[PDB]
């Protein structure tokens, strides 16, 4: 089973009745359109009406690189470098101008956030706009493709070589040299991954959410 | 900066004698039921805690005696046993440490 991230409340001192009221409006919107299981490596085609035109729909395809936003205003951002130029649209999930969202290729990459694809080569981020969705299997594991990208030279947008980001989707070795491998390992900070109170243990919370989900049907 | 004119006896007399600089009379205080040395609320007794820790000292002294040297720690739960006693059937199969005094009245 897959529970979508926005139904999990972020750790905080917010009253749980706020998120109970939030989940009522989440589930009433989900009756209108189907929201599929889409991961951080998933490719999505999103159709939206917009008030800028005379009432047409716009279909934008992209890789769902970053799926943060924790609440009724949950967002996901798509990428395309169509006609050689990068396009970056942050789609709100529960905004009532969406009609239907579908997955083209339901897959997942090794990293929880594919923001490094800005600094990757455009060949690893371009997608055929008129391409057909892949045939899905009913009950098997989601595909994880180890397609560790190659990048452009050293002045990146962010310091992905630092271990605070924990990027596992780069072929680092042929684009970066060993002395500035060692200097980036100076920020290793090994105590975080061994820690207890900076780890938000969320196993008990899904039981109440999944109780709320199936009782709405 | 330096004082342009010296602070006098009266201005010091008001400042260092204010109730904010004067120490507060605390009402936190009780008398211990057992020992009788007067304790404070919300803390433990200084006399009763020194009683337990100095009783803890010869107990932990003997833990180092039955091993000898470092990096040797038991994998079994332990029960301390005083004189005039027998190990129980629940206490069978533990590391049982013996200190040669009588069983204290605060130990159960």
């Amino acid at each position: 089973r897959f529970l979508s991230p926005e139904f999990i409340p972020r750790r905080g001192r917010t009253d749980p009745l706020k998120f109970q009221i939030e989940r009522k409006d989440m589930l009433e919107r989900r009756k209108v359109l189907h929201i599929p299981e889409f991961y951080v490596g998933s490719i999505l085609r999103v159709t939206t009406a917009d008030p800028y035109a005379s009432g047409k729909i716009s279909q934008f395809l992209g890789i769902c690189i970053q799926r943060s936003g924790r609440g009724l205003g949950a967002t996901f951002i798509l990428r395309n470098v169509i006609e050689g130029q990068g396009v970056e649209i942050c789609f709100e999930l529960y905004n009532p101008r969406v009609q239907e969202i579908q997955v083209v290729k339901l897959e997942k990459r090794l990293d929880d956030s594919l923001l490094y694809l800005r600094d990757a080569l455009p060949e690893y981020s371009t997608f055929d706009v008129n391409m057909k969705p892949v045939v899905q299997e009913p009950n098997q594991k989601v595909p994880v493709n180890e397609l560790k990208v190659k990048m452009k030279p050293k002045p990146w947008s962010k310091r992905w070589e630092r271990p605070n980001f924990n990027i596992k989707g780069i072929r680092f070795d042929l684009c970066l040299t060993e002395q500035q491998m060692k200097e980036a390992q100076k920020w290793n900070q090994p105590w975080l991954e061994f820690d207890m109170m900076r780890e938000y243990d969320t196993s008990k919370i899904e039981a109440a959410i999944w109780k709320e989900i199936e009782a709405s049907k | 900066a330096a004082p342009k004119n010296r602070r006098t006896i009266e201005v010091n007399r008001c400042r260092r004698r204010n109730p904010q600089k004067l120490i507060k009379v605390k009402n936190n205080i009780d008398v211990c039921p057992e020992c009788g040395h007067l304790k404070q609320k919300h803390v433990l007794c200084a006399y009763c805690y020194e009683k337990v820790c100095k009783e803890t000292a010869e107990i932990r002294r003997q833990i180092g005696k039955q091993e000898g040297g470092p990096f040797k720690a038991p994998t079994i739960e332990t029960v301390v046993l005083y004189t005039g006693e027998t190990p129980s059937e629940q206490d069978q199969g533990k590391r049982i440490i013996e200190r040669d005094r009588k069983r204290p009245s605060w130990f159960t």
């Binding site: 001192r13 917010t14 009253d15 009745l17 706020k18 009221i21 939030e22 009522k24 409006d25 009433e28 919107r29 009756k31 209108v32 359109l33 009406a49 917009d50 008030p51 035109a53 005379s54 009432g55 047409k56 609440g71 009724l72 205003g73 709100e92 529960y94 905004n95 009532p96 101008r97 969406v98 009609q99 | 009402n27």
Partner: protein, 304 residues
């Protein structure tokens, strides 16, 4: 010797007082759920020049709200817990020009309040409230002390004045408390980066009152003005207020109709003394909406 309620109770009497006194809170709260079947004060219609009593709510948080023009309107949650009116003060001794009512909310422990405060609520037959606010009213609207006040006292489309204590920030300095520019970091500038500059001029041999110098930020009562109600949940007593409300989450506010001249005269359709659920005429649904809001459950909006 300073005491507390639980100083001499054993472990057999701690759960009993936890159960009994809380049941006394629930019995008196449920004894006061019928304003109209008790003897009320008379009901009067709205007149031009009339004012109405407000509420006290708790700020849960915010969720986004979307309108039919396709723009996102952030809306804060203002949840009314246990709102009762506590005292009426007449025209003659109100020390003002409008009369007043006192209203409290957020029932708190009866063990943690002063004895002068507790004798007030013991006459009323109510649990003691956290914060007591006083609302200016006219003599047209006058409500007997003891009636519950709910979320549907307000209506959607109504503009609302909300005030509370803002988030305290402690002793802060210059570029954060008053937003000044400060001094540059490099190019000399040895120990001056967040420092106040000149305070006054040379000919002034003093500092003026009211000059901006470091002190304590926040924790003061500020009011935001003209906030629309977009939606009301009657079941959990929610006010959906446009924008941001002063104060942190789970804080007590003061929910008054607006002071703005264009937004203070339109009060014809609003239920004038309060809203009474015992009237039993056209019982309100789960959620009362505005015209422009998108219904969760309405389909995708098409602009053509």
């Amino acid at each position: 010797s300073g005491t507390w309620w639980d100083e001499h109770l054993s472990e057999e009497n701690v759960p009993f007082i936890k159960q009994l006194v809380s049941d006394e809170d629930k019995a008196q709260l449920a004894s006061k759920l019928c304003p109209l079947k008790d003897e009320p004060w008379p009901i009067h219609p709205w007149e031009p020049g009339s004012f109405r009593v407000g509420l006290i709510a708790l700020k849960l948080g915010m969720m986004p709200l979307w309108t039919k023009d396709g723009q996102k309107h952030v809306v804060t949650l203002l949840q009314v817990q246990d709102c009762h009116v506590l005292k009426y003060t007449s025209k003659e001794n109100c020390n003002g020009k409008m009369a007043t009512l006192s209203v409290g909310g957020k029932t708190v422990s009866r063990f943690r309040k002063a004895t002068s405060i507790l004798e007030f609520y013991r006459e009323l037959g109510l649990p003691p409230k956290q914060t007591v606010k006083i609302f200016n009213i006219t003599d047209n609207a006058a409500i007997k002390p003891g009636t519950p006040l709910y979320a549907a006292h307000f209506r959607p489309g109504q503009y609302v004045d909300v005030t509370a204590k803002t988030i305290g920030k402690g002793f802060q300095g210059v570029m954060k408390r008053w937003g000044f520019k400060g001094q540059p970091a490099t190019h000399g500038q040895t120990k001056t980066h967040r420092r106040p500059g000149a305070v006054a001029t040379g000919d002034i041999g003093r500092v003026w009152p009211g000059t901006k110098m470091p002190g304590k930020m926040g924790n003061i009562y500020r009011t935001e003005y003209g906030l629309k109600v977009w939606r009301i949940n009657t079941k959990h007593n929610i006010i959906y207020v446009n924008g941001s409300v002063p104060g942190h989450k789970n804080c007590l506010v003061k929910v008054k109709d607006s002071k703005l001249p264009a937004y203070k005269d339109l009060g014809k359709n609003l239920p004038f003394p309060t809203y009474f659920p015992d009237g039993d005429e056209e019982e309100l649904p789960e959620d009362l909406y505005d015209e422009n809001v998108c219904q969760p459950g309405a389909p995708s909006i098409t602009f053509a």
